[PDB]
Amino acid sequence: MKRMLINATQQEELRVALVDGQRLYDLDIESPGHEQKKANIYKGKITRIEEAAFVDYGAERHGFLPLKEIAREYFPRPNIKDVLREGQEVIVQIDKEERGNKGAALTTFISLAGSYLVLMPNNPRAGGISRGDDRTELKEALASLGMGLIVRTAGVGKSAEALQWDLSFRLKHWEAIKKAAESRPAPFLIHQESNVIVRAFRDYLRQDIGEILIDNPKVLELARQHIAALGRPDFSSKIKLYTGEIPLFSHYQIESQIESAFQREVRLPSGGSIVIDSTEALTAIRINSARATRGGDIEETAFNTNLEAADEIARQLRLRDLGGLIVIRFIDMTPVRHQRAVENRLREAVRQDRARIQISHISRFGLLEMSRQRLSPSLGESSHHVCPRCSGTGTVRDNESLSLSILRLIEEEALKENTQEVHAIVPVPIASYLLNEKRSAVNAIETRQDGVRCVIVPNDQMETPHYHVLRVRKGEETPTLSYMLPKLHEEAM
Amino acid sequence: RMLINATQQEELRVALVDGQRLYDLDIESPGHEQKKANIYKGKITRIEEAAFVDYGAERHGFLPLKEIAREYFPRPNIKDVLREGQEVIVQIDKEERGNKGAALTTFISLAGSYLVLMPAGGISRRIEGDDRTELKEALASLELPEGMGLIVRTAGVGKSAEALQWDLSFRLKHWEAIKKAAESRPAPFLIHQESNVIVRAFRDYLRQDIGEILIDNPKVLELARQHIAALGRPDFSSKIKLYTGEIPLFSHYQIESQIESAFQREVRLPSGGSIVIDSTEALTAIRINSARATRGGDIEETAFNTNLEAADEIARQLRLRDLGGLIVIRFIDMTPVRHQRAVENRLREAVRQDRARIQISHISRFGLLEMSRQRLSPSLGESSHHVCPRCSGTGTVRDNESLSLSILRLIEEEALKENTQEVHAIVPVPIASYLLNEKRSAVNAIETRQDGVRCVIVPNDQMETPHYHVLRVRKGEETPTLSYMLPKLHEEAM
Amino acid sequence: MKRMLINATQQEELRVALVDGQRLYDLDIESPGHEQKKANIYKGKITRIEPSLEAAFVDYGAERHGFLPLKEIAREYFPRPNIKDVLREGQEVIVQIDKEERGNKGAALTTFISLAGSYLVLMPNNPRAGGISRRIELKEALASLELPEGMGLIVRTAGVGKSAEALQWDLSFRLKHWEAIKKAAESRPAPFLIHQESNVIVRAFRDYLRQDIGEILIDNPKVLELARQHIAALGRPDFSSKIKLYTGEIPLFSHYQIESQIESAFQREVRLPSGGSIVIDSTEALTAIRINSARATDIEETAFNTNLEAADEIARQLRLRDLGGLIVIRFIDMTPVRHQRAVENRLREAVRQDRARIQISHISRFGLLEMSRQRLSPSLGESSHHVCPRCSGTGTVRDNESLSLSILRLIEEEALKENTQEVHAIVPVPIASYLLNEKRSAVNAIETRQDGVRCVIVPNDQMETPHYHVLRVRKGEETPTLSYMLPKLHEEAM
Amino acid sequence: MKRMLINATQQEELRVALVDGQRLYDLDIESPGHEQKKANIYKGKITRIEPSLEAAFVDYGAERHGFLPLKEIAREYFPRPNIKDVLREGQEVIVQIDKEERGNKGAALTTFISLAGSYLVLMPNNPRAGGISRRIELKEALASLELPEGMGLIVRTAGVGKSAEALQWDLSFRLKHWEAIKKAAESRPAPFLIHQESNVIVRAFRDYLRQDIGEILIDNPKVLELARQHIAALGRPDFSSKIKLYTGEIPLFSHYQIESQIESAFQREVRLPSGGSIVIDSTEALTAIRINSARGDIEETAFNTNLEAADEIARQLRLRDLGGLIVIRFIDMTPVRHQRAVENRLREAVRQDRARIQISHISRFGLLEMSRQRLSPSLGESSHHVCPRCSGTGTVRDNESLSLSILRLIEEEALKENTQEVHAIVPVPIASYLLNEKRSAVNAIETRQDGVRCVIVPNDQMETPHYHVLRVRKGEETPTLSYMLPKLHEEAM
RNA sequence: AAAAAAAAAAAAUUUUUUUUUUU
Ligand SMILES: [Zn+2]
Ligand SMILES: [Zn+2]
């Protein structure tokens, strides 16, 4: 049986888990505090125009809107200046939220989701039915109901008159968009990203789930209320309390599976593992073998490990809510039939979450390419931050290589015109290497580039990958002692 | 030109420059550069038409029948040729393929002063005319033993016949002396020369289109002229010249900023785009970024020209970094196919100047191009960096309260165990501050619900956000040790 | 009203206080574990003899010998010039600990056992010692006591108004306790202990109990139970009516407002009603007090009044701290002597209220008053603090350049030695920064003038400003160890 | 031979040492910080008046007040009970700094300037003071001097045997200099500086240089040049024959083996030839010395060790330039005549100082009291700073005893009305002890003083001695995380 | 963290989780 388990015993992160008996199928965790860095909707103004235009919506860095995402409601496709004009105001949704010095990515194609159908108020072309005899007769119902709309899997077999029930809520909710836009305040939006209940059921709750188990009565009562508000008050019969002495997720033994969604590596029943590495623009998965078993059949070892990997990779894609481009390095399979079998097993595992996923065949190099629909940012870089030490490179520069580089950087600052001093402020061991092993070269710099003071400072506040070299121009000289330079710069910077 | 910087002995830097464009580079330090394509002793550890060799590498090396000479037989199975626990002397033919150990060969060869001993025949093609027709007269007198082969080396030109008629005995002794080495030395250990990394740097790079070699250290210049003259090419020594300026050689040609582009994560491009290079456990991903959109840019010219510059730059970085194994490149999306193809063939032509094998796929639907590069030596990422000690190479660290709540639910499951009297968590200061104040209610909840078990949470000065410990105290083996003493114990117990 | 207040709700320190209304009168705080050097009576073995020291060293059960001077041996142990005329090796003696825990050294010992009761002290090994406390019909009551012949006794101030028949009760317990000691001492094997630190009432009442105490208030019922039992065992079950529990939400010591007064016993400086203060500094051998006036705004009347208030508070701190040994005071200078003596007599009157003996000399030529106090137990300074690991108890740290230049010439003076190849200094970050930038010219001057010696200076994370190390490397001891590896070496090697 | 050795090879401290053969005799070390509180003569403005103190406060141009008691005001400033009968605000006086930099409190001043030459000291504002050295032609020569009326003079130790004509040379410079003082004083504005502690060459000799010193050795030629110039202006140009350079590769102080003796002036403890030692501790108002024995005949060893200690204590009193009250535990001696012998050994060792020194007898408790004149701040005041860790107490409170005191301070704050939270910011081991060993009591406080939160924060930036406990009033609560509270309070307060 | 054994709990009574055990 499929079951949904909700853990809310500690309010600082609400955990919702979808389970197949004892196997965790899907996960969402949202916290109050920090900043909840996903999927917000905003009201904003066009501020600069060029394959995109830039929107001021009250964020500290502007949003980015490309030509693909410009709705017809802007119009008066070579240049955006032929489509847009300054000071024009629209509601937009963030895909990627204010990362670094790049703007937050936007769309104007907001969509409103119901119990049976999703409404596309800005796009009359977009419509369809989620992936036979059911689809086609539902498409006749859909066709009978500037808007477009899509019908959810929970709409399977619903009549053209039941769908007319749910659509009345959706069109009220479009009136709520129009109230938000010209009735309500300048930064305002419709019912927000912060809702605990609606988004949690509506994205993933489907009828073959047998029970919802909840550990907090005060949350369970609001769940009853919202599932009744979502039009399913009969389905409230499935909501049940939990009371057991082991906490709910350790009671069903999904606790380690949940934390596997944060792990870099997941091990597999045959003893192989999948390793997930995220890069600038793609997520790379590498699959690792178990022991060779003293001349076992390496084809079935690879093929079975790849299959158990495909079963796990589709699941991690769900659990992490990954999006954008992915690359998979499966173990090398000689015959084509093994390659096909892994490709189609992956397809059959990933289609059962509703998010659009697209897959290539295995290349000559053994690399498979796939993509996943951009529904929200992953757990990575929403419950994580960029590593302050290595700046997110994942590597530290080797101590002698850095020391010798700083030595020649000092030399190249001291070569400059108008130069009176150079200060290198460095980690303690870097200073130790410079001022003993390379002291002969620091003296060589001070004597060749004659007249420049060279100061090398060991800093308490630095560790290997961070250093500063600074130059002092004529008349900027100071009596400040060498050990006082970091104390100055903690205030000065 | 070829520019050699060695004014600092702690790393030897060799650069190849075209005009003032650095086009190829090598930087490795002594003391942890490995000279040869090394020869090692190893143990036959698993067998099937190959055997697997423990030569001290982290994953065993591969010894196929392709590279086993019949003199190593005691032909369907190596199980019938070799046995478990057998000790073999073998050479690295290919160095650390991807995840795997080295591929290995038994065809060891020893280089003498006229010849290379194959304990096969011919002469160096590089010697000509009246040289070959005297060198053949020096060869024909040599007393090489039965069943051994030879190659007459380029170094053989001008060497006198009556010294080297004896000198061939050293290589014939050295083939037996390998036995002495193999039973005196430990197994994962080195063997004599054939691998001077400064002279052999010419073997990697020096061919006739190079006009000059400029060397800023006079002793390295002395050793270079000595080697190129000893290799029998004293005419070619006319290319080797000193540098003497007070600005260092690489700043004199203004390549010093270009060299460190081989170490940066990101290199910016003349059109204002950039390439970003990331390494994963088995492949390298490159992303190409446009310039910030400004003042009426043209969308196809921006994408296409930035990609073409990025293709030239990527081929250049591939050389500079000495990357190897699989690569994936995400170019900027180009609408018309001929622009895509033109970028592919620009990359192909740029990389064909490399002497390494490089192979390239077509651009996929997603805008991803796949390629390979030959596994010639460790990259700059392997020689000059190590994995981040904080994050262990993720490049991102969990948010403090999120990691705290993960540690809290681990503590809760440790307290649920049988045979348990206390649970100790040792954590970074902010984790303890959060758990022992914000989540104090939960710590009390664990201590009261999982009845009878003590919970200790210790703030440690010695920890950063990624690392923590949670531990078990057995019933009756409990200790009176104070909370702040537990890290002082565990830094020295384990 | 005088009260005794006990706070025992937190076991990691038991607090016993005497209060005069809301004014704290006397205090002890001791932490748990009855670690036993108090007044211990032992059977011990004579293990070394030193007539040069005039002492014997006794193995009484401790891991380090106890010290028994010739001053402290009763004639019963003789076979007064030499220990060799008075004791011999392997002799067994009965002894009592007089002095607690000098340094690393064992306890000092006497053979003149004394047992102190509620009203009297019994001197069973000394017939000459006897009297009545000078703080006091009691001489007639004493003369009526049936004291055993050859013993002495002294009567306490607690004998005030007591009857000749109540005094015989205390005498009956104390002499029974000595008869038990004798039965134990001659039945039991030599290396053993006869009575010990651990009794709560013997510590509590004998240090504090007088009849004018109106109440004893206790906030822990397990203690109150044992208090009523012990005061009944003392034979005052009627006095158990004074023992009462405290139950308020404000803790006992904050209800009587003494909790702020207790912390004055820990401070270096204590403020006074006239706005002056007293500052207490303890040195190698004496405790010196300074008295300060208030801020400026008649200074002569202020000086005299502040000295008097300081004398009352100094006598009170001498109690609360349980100070012992020599004490020295700077009062504010008073012109007429009769005001100096008036302050001395205020001090005398404030210290007569201590039952520990105190002795005073007159105010000196330089305005120093010298006095001593009986070493009944280690003070709060000796028992509840440890020496500063940074300043080593000076209260001062050397200036960074003042230290750096001294290290600089220490490095030079090591480099001057013959047979020398390297010198290493390991020093704090700022000291290394000063040595290697400000004084780099001098470091180079040493390397060139004291030619042939390598000079290494290492900034250490694990050293503060006060400490440093400087070391010398002899001929051929040279090592490839990196500079920043030298501390890592010495933390593991030493 | 007695020698003066000057070491100047390193400019950051100039070292002047005086040696009796190879025994270090006297020392001064000064760093080139040209801070002039030292001893200079000034003109100042009467700025505050205190008949309560019988004193006045003077503006002499410093940011720190001068203190000028009626003890120190000459009758030339009057219009002896009250300063209001002597002074008014804005009156201008000639003054000299007597006391340097007590605490925050002002430098003490005198108007009774005295000018000290090479053979004599002139007392131009004081007729009463004059005579001949206690520690020593001269009876004729003194009477022959043409000393101006109303001035006094004192003959120096260096005046031994000096002629009736040499003394008239030195007198002429002193009476020149008093005119220069008055000319400056009545020409120039109100607060200003008249004359200088140009000590390094000239007065470094003149306060120190006696005819019995055989050589002056100098390692810096620029200093040697300035020495030979000044010794001629001092009127001893024949003595310029004695100024010599030192040139060896071993530095001057290590050649004469005094370098190891000098550091004894910085140490807490100094060793003695009999294997004993002396321990010097300085307190709020006095310096206490203790003498310790070696592990001989105990009565004879005590007496000999006390004598060797007296020799060294007199020498340390000079080398440290100690000042104020001194107290000594000598080892207790049975016969009294050994007590006076040590007392008078100490007297004879200190009578060699020109600083005023006074000694009492060994007291009842075996304590000897003495005093020494405050000629300048010691090496303890000039070349050390108060320990930052212990606040100069010399002890650290035990972690549990401090923890339990903080615990009950937290409880006593949480008892207060108008109180919403209590925050304690503490060192790591104190928080560790409070929140684990004493967690039951923290919970006890949170339950008894119900409604008030207790937060205990482990701080990176606090050592064992320091702590803060703070009170949060109604509505002052914050969502700021516990680990963020130190960052908040470092910026706010 | 590897073989066998015994206990507790969860989904369908056998793979899963924990703990412990090996002259
Ligand atoms: Zn990192
Ligand atoms: Zn200190």
Residue numbers in the entry:
A (entry chain G): 1 to 50, 54 to 79, 87 to 141, 145 to 158, 163 to 510
B (entry chain A): 3 to 50, 54 to 79, 87 to 131, 136 to 510
C (entry chain N): 1 to 79, 87 to 143, 150 to 310, 314 to 510
D (entry chain L): 1 to 79, 87 to 143, 150 to 308, 313 to 510
Q: Can I see the authors' text?
A:
Ribonuclease E (RNase E) is a metal-dependent hydrolytic enzyme that cleaves polymeric ribonucleic acid internally and serves as a central element in RNA metabolism of diverse bacteria. The NTD of RNase E (1–529) is highly conserved and harbors the catalytic activity of the enzyme.
To identify additional RNA-enzyme interaction sites within the NTD of RNase E, co-crystallizations were undertaken of the complex of full-length sRNA RprA with the catalytically inactive RNase E (1–510) D303R, D346R. Diffraction data were collected from tens of specimens prepared under different buffer conditions, and the highest resolution obtained was 3.95 Å. The duplex binding region is formed by a surface presented by the RNase H domain of one protomer and the small domain of the partner protomer that forms the principal dimer (i.e., the dimer unit of the dimer of dimers within the tetramer). Thus, the complex of the RNA duplex with RNase E identified in the crystal structures with RprA and SdsR sRNAs revealed a surface of 8 amino acids of RNase E that could potentially interact with the RNA, namely R3, Q22, H268, Y269, Q270 (from the RNase H domain), K433, R488, and R490 (from the small domain). The identified duplex binding surface comprises a relatively large area, with binding defined between the protein and RNA backbone rather than particular bases.
